[PDB]
């Protein structure tokens, strides 16, 4: 059975854990419990292929920035999450992508840009600006909501397809 090592990254508060818990448990976490590092191994069917998703839910707190090198070396694809109502989280995406490229020593790393919290009306990052950033990276861009489940399945499955298509 093929395994896909997925890593969810992004600034503190963007909804990394809420996206992961919505994907696996089908419910929305309203609480904010900062993550250190959690892992989930889930069997799923994607495009008729039974596979194992090994998902790492990482810390956004800049205090745990030393743990990044290890998960960037082992991770096969990265879900780079920003929140559409947090401009700092959108600007921080560049730092996550640069560090991934440096650790992998490659500009072609499976990655998906995710604009989370699309259910909120307090938007500060234009969809067009995020689309333009993802185009400049050569990667897919998907808007998601861990509350409504909009784009959640699409974001994770698109990342698996990027790992499967880089292969
Ligand atoms: N409205 C809305 N709120 C969300 C969404 N995703 C997460 N949140 C909220 O944002 C807060 C932080 O979510 P959380 O999943 O812990 O974010 P995180 O990126 O994992 C935080 P850390 O980096 O410290 O692990 C929570 O209150 C959660 O309910 C979303 O899509 N929509
Ligand atoms: Mg978290």
């Amino acid at each position: 059975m093929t395994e896909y090592k997925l890593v969810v990254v992004g600034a503190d508060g963007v909804g990394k854990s809420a996206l992961t818990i919505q994907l696996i448990q089908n419910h929305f976490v309203d609480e904010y419990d900062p993550t250190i590092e959690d892992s989930y191994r889930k069997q799923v069917v994607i495009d008729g292929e039974t596979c194992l998703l090994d998902i790492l839910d990482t810390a956004g707190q800049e205090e745990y920035s030393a743990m990044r090198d290890q998960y960037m070396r082992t991770g096969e694809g990265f879900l780079c999450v920003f929140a559409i109502n947090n401009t700092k989280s959108f600007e921080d995406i560049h730092h996550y992508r640069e560090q991934i490229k440096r650790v992998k020593d490659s500009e072609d790393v499976p990655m998906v840009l995710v604009g989370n919290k699309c259910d909120l009306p307090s938007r500060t990052v234009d969809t067009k600006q995020a689309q333009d950033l993802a185009r400049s990276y050569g990667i897919p861009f998907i808007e998601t909501s861990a509350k409504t489940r909009q784009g959640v399945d699409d974001a994770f499955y698109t990342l698996v397809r990027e790992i499967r298509k880089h292969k």
Side-chain angles (χ1 to χ4, degrees), residues 6 20 24 35 37-42 53-58:
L6 315 193
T20 302
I24 296 162
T35 305
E37 204 170 274
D38 300 333
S39 73
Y40 302 95
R41 293 174 67 94
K42 305 290 150 179
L53 308 186
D54 182 355
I55 306 165
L56 193 75
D57 177 22
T58 73

Side-chain angles (χ1 to χ4, degrees), residues 12-13 15-18 32-36 38 57-60:
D12 179 28
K16 297 183 290 305
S17 298
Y32 188 159
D33 184 16
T35 305
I36 294 172
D38 300 333
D57 177 22
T58 73

Side-chain angles (χ1 to χ4, degrees), residues 43-104:
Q43 201 177 286
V44 72
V45 177
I46 302 179
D47 307 325
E49 170 206 3
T50 301
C51 55
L52 189 135
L53 308 186
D54 182 355
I55 306 165
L56 193 75
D57 177 22
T58 73
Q61 277 178 344
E62 293 176 18
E63 283 73 21
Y64 303 97
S65 57
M67 286 179 181
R68 304 188 189 158
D69 186 79
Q70 189 78 256
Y71 73 67
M72 287 172 186
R73 283 179 188 244
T74 62
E76 299 177 308
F78 302 82
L79 210 66
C80 301
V81 189
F82 73 93
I84 63 129
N85 66 337
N86 179 336
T87 66
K88 182 180 180 290
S89 77
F90 178 66
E91 294 180 39
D92 288 347
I93 282 302
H94 167 87
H95 302 294
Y96 272 102
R97 176 159 173 92
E98 287 302 308
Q99 193 178 353
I100 288 164
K101 293 191 308 172
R102 198 226 87 185
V103 171
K104 295 296 200 196

Side-chain angles (χ1 to χ4, degrees), residues 117-148:
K117 313 198 178 187
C118 69
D119 57 283
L120 295 176
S122 59
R123 173 185 294 271
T124 62
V125 180
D126 249 28
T127 301
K128 169 66 168 155
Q129 198 174 342
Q131 197 165 40
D132 291 346
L133 184 69
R135 283 184 184 162
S136 84
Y137 294 169
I139 70 175
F141 168 57
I142 300 170
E143 283 198 357
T144 65
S145 169
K147 179 196 279 191
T148 70

